[PDB]
Design a protein around this nucleic acid. Structure first.
Lengths: 51, 146, 64
RNA sequence: GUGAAAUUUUAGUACCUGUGAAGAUGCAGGUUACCCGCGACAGGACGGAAAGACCCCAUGGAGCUUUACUGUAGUUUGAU
RNA sequence: GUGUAGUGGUAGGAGAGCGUUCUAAGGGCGUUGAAGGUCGAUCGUGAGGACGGCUGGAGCGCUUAGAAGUGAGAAUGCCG
RNA sequence: UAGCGGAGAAAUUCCAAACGAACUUGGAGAUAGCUGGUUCUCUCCGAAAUAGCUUUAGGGCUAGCCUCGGAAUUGAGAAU
RNA sequence: UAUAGUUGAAGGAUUUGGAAAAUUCCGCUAAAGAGGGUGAAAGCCCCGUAGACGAAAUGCUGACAACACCUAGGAGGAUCCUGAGUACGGCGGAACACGAGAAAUUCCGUCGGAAUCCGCGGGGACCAUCCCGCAAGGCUAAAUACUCCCUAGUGACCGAUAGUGAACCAGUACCGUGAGGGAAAGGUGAAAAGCACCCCGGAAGGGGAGUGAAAUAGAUCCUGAAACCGUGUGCCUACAACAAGUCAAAGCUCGUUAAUGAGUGAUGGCGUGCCUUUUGUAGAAUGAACCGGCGAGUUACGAUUGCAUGCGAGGUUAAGUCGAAGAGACGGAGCCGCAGCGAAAGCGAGUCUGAAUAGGGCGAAUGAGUAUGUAGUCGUAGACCCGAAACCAUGUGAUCUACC
């Protein structure tokens, strides 16, 4: 969602994971992957910027 | 659609034409240009419209006209553009526009008489073709040269 | 850069609304005591540009 | 004993009368001819060296002449 | 399936393909020998592709898409 | 003593082996209607050496002849 | 804050090897899985990275102190001040997109020469009304252009004929009196462990023995192609006129990716190379000595047509700001289409010409665009590459020769 960084500072894992906020979701950073995790607030935030 | 299975829209990307790579392509040894002649050096070809020696067309016929320094051309809207403001809205050369109808009012909005209107709007513009006032007052509207 | 138009043609050509071009005829600036009346009357009426030249100058008049 | 060069499409590289871009070692039809060298000559290989100096063209150059055109250094004349 | 029909070609127009280097994702091979080199009596209509024997000793293939310093027998070419 | 020049008992003679205008660097990848070259493959179709005008004649433009994509009526094409 | 630094997490065994980071088991760490190195390819061996700490000295940048400097209203309009050989005019030249043109505006050289607020300049010759300003005295940060140099980084950039001319002791060797011109040259193995000792040989060189996983890795030192030079041998060749082959074929020797097999070849048939330029080629027209390597239609900005995609009487952003040199939204100035005719005043589904309601030119009557990718062509640019004789501007030369 936003600067709850304590949930990103544990995303330097095996590159099986990669982290990104809800303002930078691009095309590739979704198409390149298979499953997607997202908190409940990030869903609504996405559903805002995307009008 | 996945990364390792990309397909472009069919018929949407041609290939190229690299000229001068061997006599089977059909374009080797004079690169699709032929024999000698100044169409076949590097950067040959004459300027546009030049005609050998003839007096070219643009000097064979005469000059004419001038340009008034202060012409005024308006931004005509004919009659059916109006036919979506059903009954009483104060059409105006202003925030009317503001609807995706007429941007860039050049020198004030004219109104024309093509081709059929059945409403009772109220029209305000900066000129009118004589038939347009008759159409408006025929359906019973108003007018004002404002 | 930008393709330059031709200030030699724009002073002789008017573009109609179907695509063609207009041009005022030649032989109308000088000695008339030679040409007849028909020959000088029928030359007050501009005409178009042939199919030929609109192939070769369709580029210089790219905008005007 | 030491040890180059220009040249060179690959070559198992004969003669006659024809034929051919109109004079052929190499095509045609005939005649002569075992394989490999060594010393001499210079008819031929349109022989080698110089992308014709003769001639024309390039809407090519450069140097020179003049009552060819256009200008100018210089000499002189008038006003201020 | 089956009938009918056509398939010489320079300048040139049109169409479909082979191959080299690199990038991206997916999936792979490699001291139990990769690239490169050599030999082979093999496969497709072409450009071209595999397989095995010897040498060699550290990196390269395959699929889909992308970008080009992408293909050489002639320039009295330039370097060894 | 110096190159828009110098020197010449005068020949277009000489000015670092080449002077009808020295050499070296820059404008400069100067310009050339002229010559030479231009690399992988298959399928389909496939010409012209003519008229007109040109400070034009080995150049160029339009017209004719070639190829590719669309619209429309045909009955317009052809050979008897 | 810039110039030295400090700290910094987690592994063993098995199979191949000369050597494991390889393979197979079983574990662990991560705010640290970016990178480099170690006897082959490492998250856990080493240097590091994520973090956290750190300056005696010197420099810069802030901040606030202290000091320096600067700055006041209202009312009156009798008289005074408000930039002089200046503005501007003629003449001759230059600068403005403006080549004297009907030529405003701005400079320069020469000559002539204004007014003073009831005044002066300008609004593209010039005049009148109106409107906007006050020249002939100076200073002034930021937003803009560049990179010899230092620091840290990146790249669908090069990998010893490439990339700077130069990866090596290079503007050096060498050439020219001088200005000036200017190369070729990287690779042993993991570690020199770089061959003690014997033998032939004057030496060089070599043969054993050794070091080494490998010496056909031995200092010309990884791999090691082609032209060119040699040794051995299976088949043929001394009555034969051969673009040098292919079709036919006896014999002789073989035995493969195992299939209507391989090598050679007595003898017969047929047959004038390759490239370019040309009406025409074997041409006695023209180019190649041979092998290898490099070596030619590209890119930016416009224009136009076909293909495709998103919206459609609409389409559509630009500069610029936040952002990782990205994406990724804001940003509606502007361009294109939706209406045309006329030189123009103008008219408007009409309009122009015309005395005309005549006729005729041009458009309407359904008739679609626009943004981007892509490809074909064209334009400005060196624009497919190589090729002159010449021209202009700074320099360098009279040690040869000419005159003194």
């Amino acid at each position: 969602e936003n600067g709850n960084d304590f949930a990103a500072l544990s995303a330097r894992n095996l590159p099986n994971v990669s982290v990104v906020t809800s303002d930078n979701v691009s095309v590739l950073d979704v198409v390149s992957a298979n499953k997607v995790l997202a908190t409940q607030t990030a869903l609504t935030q996405i559903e805002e910027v995307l009008a | 659609m996945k990364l390792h299975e990309l397909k472009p829209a069919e018929g949407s990307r041609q290939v190229r034409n690299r000229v001068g790579r061997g006599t089977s392509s059909g374009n080797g040894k004079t690169a699709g240009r032929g024999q000698k002649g100044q169409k076949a050096r590097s950067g040959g070809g004459v300027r546009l419209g030049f005609e050998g020696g003839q007096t070219p067309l643009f000097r064979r016929l005469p000059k004419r006209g001038f340009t008034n320094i202060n012409r005024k051309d308006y931004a005509v809207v004919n009659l059916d553009t109006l036919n979506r403001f059903e009954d009483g809205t104060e059409v105006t050369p202003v925030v009317l526009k503001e609807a995706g109808i007429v941007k860039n009012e050049k020198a004030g909005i004219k109104v024309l008489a093509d081709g059929e209107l059945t409403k009772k709007l109220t029209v305000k513009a900066a000129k009118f073709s004589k038939s347009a006032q008759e159409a408006i007052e025929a359906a019973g509207g108003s007018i004002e040269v404002i | 850069p930008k393709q330059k138009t031709h200030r030699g043609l724009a002073k002789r050509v008017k573009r109609t609304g179907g695509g063609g071009l207009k041009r005022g005829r030649a032989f109308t600036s000088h000695r008339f005591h030679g040409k007849t009346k028909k020959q000088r009357r029928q030359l007050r009426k501009a005409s178009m540009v042939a199919k030929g030249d609109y192939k070769r100058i369709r580029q210089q008049l790219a905008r005007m």
